[PDB]
């Protein structure tokens, strides 16, 4: 039902839960890293410049 | 010939115009290139891949 309360539940669950991001191919270990997620309206994954 | 055609209009023969940032009303230092580029929407939209 994507209830508006469910979005509050998601904003509480995702608070401190890391997510692993890895691009294919991943030649070296720096290609897989953990990030603290933040919700975004769109459908693209927001990545940091550095 | 591009310069001659720009001269026919009242446009600057330099090809670069000064712009103003919409957020602060300030003028960008040094002119910037502005024109009409033909852009195409490639058939790789995100909603087919997320």
């Amino acid at each position: 039902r994507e209830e508006a309360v469910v979005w509050d539940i998601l904003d509480e669950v995702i608070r401190e839960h890391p997510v692993l991001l890895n691009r294919a191919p991943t030649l070296h270990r720096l290609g897989i890293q953990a990030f603290e997620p933040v919700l975004i309206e769109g459908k693209a994954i927001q990545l940091h410049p550095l | 010939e591009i310069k001659e055609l720009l001269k026919l209009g009242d446009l600057p023969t330099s090809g670069q115009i000064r712009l103003y940032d919409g957020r602060t009303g300030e003028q960008f230092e040094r002119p910037v290139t502005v024109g009409y580029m033909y852009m195409l929407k490639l058939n790789h939209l995100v909603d087919d891949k997320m």
Binding site: - | Y36, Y38, L40, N43
Partner: protein
Amino acid sequence: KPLVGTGMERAVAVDSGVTAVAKRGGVVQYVDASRIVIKVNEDEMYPGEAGIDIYNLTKYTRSNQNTCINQMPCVSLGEPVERGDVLADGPSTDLGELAL
């Protein structure tokens, strides 16, 4: 349309087979965005044939990439045309010139 092209569109859009092309010269008699009927002039009319050439334009139809390929008219009622003129613009084409 593209503002800056190379003039190759006037051929690529025509020979693609996606735009409706006037088979013979004549004057447009009726258009309804589906069927354009042309009164082909008697100079190229067969003596026994109808003397009036239809063009059932193709509307929204799925392509191999799940896109629409409808053709829309560009000529006006009563406008004269000559054989080879583009009557209805196909997808990515407008006024007989390719426009992606």
